[PDB]
Amino acid sequence: HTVLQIGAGGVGSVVAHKMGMNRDVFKNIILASRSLDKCYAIKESMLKKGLGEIGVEQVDADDTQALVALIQKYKPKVVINVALPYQDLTIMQACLETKTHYIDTANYKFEYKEQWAFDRAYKEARILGVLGAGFDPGVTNAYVAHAQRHHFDTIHTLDILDCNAGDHKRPFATNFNPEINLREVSSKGRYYENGKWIETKPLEIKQVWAYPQIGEMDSYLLYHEELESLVKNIKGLRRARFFMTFSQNYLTHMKCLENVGMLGIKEIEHQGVKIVPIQFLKTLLPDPATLAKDTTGKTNIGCYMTGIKNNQDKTLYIYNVCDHKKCYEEVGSQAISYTTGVPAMCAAKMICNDTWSADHFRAGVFNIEELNTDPFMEELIKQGLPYEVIER
Amino acid sequence: MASMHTVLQIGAGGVGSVVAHKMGMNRDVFKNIILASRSLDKCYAIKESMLKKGLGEIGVEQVDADDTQALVALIQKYKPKVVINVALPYQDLTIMQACLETKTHYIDTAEYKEQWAFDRAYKEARILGVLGAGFDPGVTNAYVAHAQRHHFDTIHTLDILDCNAGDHKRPFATNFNPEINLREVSSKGRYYENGKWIETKPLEIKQVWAYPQIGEMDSYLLYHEELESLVKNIKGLRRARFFMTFSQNYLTHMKCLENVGMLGIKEIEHQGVKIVPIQFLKTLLPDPATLAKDTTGKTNIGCYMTGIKNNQDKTLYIYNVCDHKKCYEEVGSQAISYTTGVPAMCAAKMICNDTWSADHFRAGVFNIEELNTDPFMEELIKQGLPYEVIE
Numbered sequence: 001h002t003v004l005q006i007g008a009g010g011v012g013s014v015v016a017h018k019m020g021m022n023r024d025v026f027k028n029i030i031l032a033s034r035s036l037d038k039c040y041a042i043k044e045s046m047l048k049k050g051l052g053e054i055g056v057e058q059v060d061a062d063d064t065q066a067l068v069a070l071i072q073k074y075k076p077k078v079v080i081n082v083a084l085p086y087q088d089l090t091i092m093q094a095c096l097e098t099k100t101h102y103i104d105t106a107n108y109k110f111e112y113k114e115q116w117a118f119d120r121a122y123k124e125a126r127i128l129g130v131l132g133a134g135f136d137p138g139v140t141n142a143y144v145a146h147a148q149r150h151h152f153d154t155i156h157t158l159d160i161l162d163c164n165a166g167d168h169k170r171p172f173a174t175n176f177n178p179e180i181n182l183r184e185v186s187s188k189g190r191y192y193e194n195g196k197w198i199e200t201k202p203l204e205i206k207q208v209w210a211y212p213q214i215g216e217m218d219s220y221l222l223y224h225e226e227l228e229s230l231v232k233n234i235k236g237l238r239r240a241r242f243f244m245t246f247s248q249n250y251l252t253h254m255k256c257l258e259n260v261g262m263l264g265i266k267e268i269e270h271q272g273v274k275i276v277p278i279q280f281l282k283t284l285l286p287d288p289a290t291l292a293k294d295t296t297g298k299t300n301i302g303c304y305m306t307g308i309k310n311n312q313d314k315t316l317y318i319y320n321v322c323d324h325k326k327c328y329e330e331v332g333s334q335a336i337s338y339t340t341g342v343p344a345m346c347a348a349k350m351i352c353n354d355t356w357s358a359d360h361f362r363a364g365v366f367n368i369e370e371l372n373t374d375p376f377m378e379e380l381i382k383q384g385l386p387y388e389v390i391e392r
Numbered sequence: 393m394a395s396m397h398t399v400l401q402i403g404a405g406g407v408g409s410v411v412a413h414k415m416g417m418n419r420d421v422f423k424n425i426i427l428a429s430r431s432l433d434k435c436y437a438i439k440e441s442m443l444k445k446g447l448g449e450i451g452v453e454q455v456d457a458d459d460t461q462a463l464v465a466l467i468q469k470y471k472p473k474v475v476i477n478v479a480l481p482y483q484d485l486t487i488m489q490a491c492l493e494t495k496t497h498y499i500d501t502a503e504y505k506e507q508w509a510f511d512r513a514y515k516e517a518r519i520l521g522v523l524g525a526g527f528d529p530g531v532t533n534a535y536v537a538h539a540q541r542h543h544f545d546t547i548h549t550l551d552i553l554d555c556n557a558g559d560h561k562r563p564f565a566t567n568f569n570p571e572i573n574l575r576e577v578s579s580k581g582r583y584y585e586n587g588k589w590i591e592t593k594p595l596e597i598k599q600v601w602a603y604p605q606i607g608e609m610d611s612y613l614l615y616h617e618e619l620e621s622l623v624k625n626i627k628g629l630r631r632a633r634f635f636m637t638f639s640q641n642y643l644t645h646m647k648c649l650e651n652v653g654m655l656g657i658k659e660i661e662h663q664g665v666k667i668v669p670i671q672f673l674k675t676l677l678p679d680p681a682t683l684a685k686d687t688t689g690k691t692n693i694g695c696y697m698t699g700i701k702n703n704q705d706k707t708l709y710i711y712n713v714c715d716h717k718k719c720y721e722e723v724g725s726q727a728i729s730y731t732t733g734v735p736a737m738c739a740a741k742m743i744c745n746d747t748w749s750a751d752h753f754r755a756g757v758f759n760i761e762e763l764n765t766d767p768f769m770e771e772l773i774k775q776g777l778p779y780e781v782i783e
Contacts, residue, residue: 170651172648172651253648253652256645257648259564260564260645260654260673260676260677262652262654262676275667283661283662283663284654284656
């Protein structure tokens, strides 16, 4: 089979690389992006690693008509959106117009409104739209769905816990555009409890949590995309929360940068030239491609649920641990891009071998917890993202 | 008896405003006060401020202090008795040259090699060259000289302790150009002990010291200009060290700023435009003139000496405390610019009423500890910087 991937960033290189590891399913792989240089670089690494050749194209993902012509040129079975989060709606519309299947990952106050509003159109066109096929959201959605059907009768509470304990060996550096980092630590927290959404102050709710294979880490309450999906799609939920770890090193740096004005979004005039501080910060901080080679450590993402099984109390903790350096030696990217990009390729496999389909019974726009997670989880294990359970 | 005189001041910054204001408080000495700078805006701001405070009128002139002939023409126009250099620190060598060419007396506030090389020329011209008439150097040099002749026969140890305990009410802000700040915390430390100069790691030697009217503050060992002159001019010195306070808040910011590359001095390309990181930091941070109105707190600068007076161990602590808000209410600047500029005006007064003179072999280029500090100290008390002695 043949698939079209739009995006050649850190997460996009994992999808292309891992796709090249499964050449029994993905016969022809085509990559398109605004930056042609990044595409050929991904082509080279895969060629250097003996995974075959990839097709390379340039495309403006803000232009639906250019995307439609691109899709019609290669006639792919599914299009993977690993590009910018503002181009998700023009890529979704192109998939609709061209009657091709759609997957997105890494979409970064977010709402599912406009992506979900394509359901009726996607249904009437007999195609599938899988939203958030990353890790959080994505595999975490599968973890909750996998526990609804194999480990619980009723789920009362859910806590999603994201921990990155990697060391890039630099004093300070980000793996994403600094605006991501700014968003994480400056936005109000939001969680769901007893039919209401509760908003908090930025990093107002702290807690220490024991992450398997890592240790105890300071975990702060944040809002995440997946909460919206899960709260709406899992009935009977009494509490839903998302937690991410932040070290005191990192938090102090961010508060100092905020105090000098280096986290600014509005531009300011310097030497007759308008500059955006956070954008200057991106130029200063090391290029994330060079951080991958040196980064060491582990990540832990998973869900901790309390529910009821056979009218007896149960608590479940499904989680995955990923080793930054192990990812770099396998594909050449770090664990944040690996945990986000491997599910995307697994979702693509599930559509190309017809496990996940829009044919017959149902079609439309779905989150991963609405689909058959059994073959997805088995595929995640085979491709390098095995999970661990802690049941009590 | 004393004659009224004309003074030419080159510089209209924080220190330059204090010097101009303080000269306008002493109209028995300074009949004409002329201010010159590249920025007429800053000069006119000082002019208005003084008029609002009933301190008189001043003369304002535009000049590029890198142009010796432009400086010479200004001196010849006004024929001032002394020229006070509170301008940019690389322009002192051109201002000294103009003073030489016009046979006029020179004062500045901030190695001494190239500045000391004017000694022969200045002697031949029968003019005076007073270097470092700020607080440190300046009053601290005076403190050591004043203790050398009134409190000690031999001075064994000298520790200069500079403390700024003011709160500018901002999360983070600097009182000068960020390159100063970078030098302060990134340069190796240097001190003198038993005839040798010792180099240290940046902020390697810390110590807690209780500064009168402030409290205990973390003091770090640094190098300072004055050590050069003082070690050479104070006979019998066994140790000479300079200490400055740094809060953990400030230090934490500097360590973070240095880690992202925001303390960089080499240019980097950003969006096809070559940028100097630290210069961008100066644009971001509050303009230091806007901090004076909000600053509260105190400063403590002084010298701590242990020596010998008629074969008995003695220790002395001469120091000055200054209130930021009290300074702003008087002249409109904060205490860091107040402690630096008031000595400069006093040094100008010592030259205009002839306490400090070039007549009768008294000429050449000097540091404050090489001069008659007794009327200098009396003037510092009168002008707003009284000191405290503790034995």
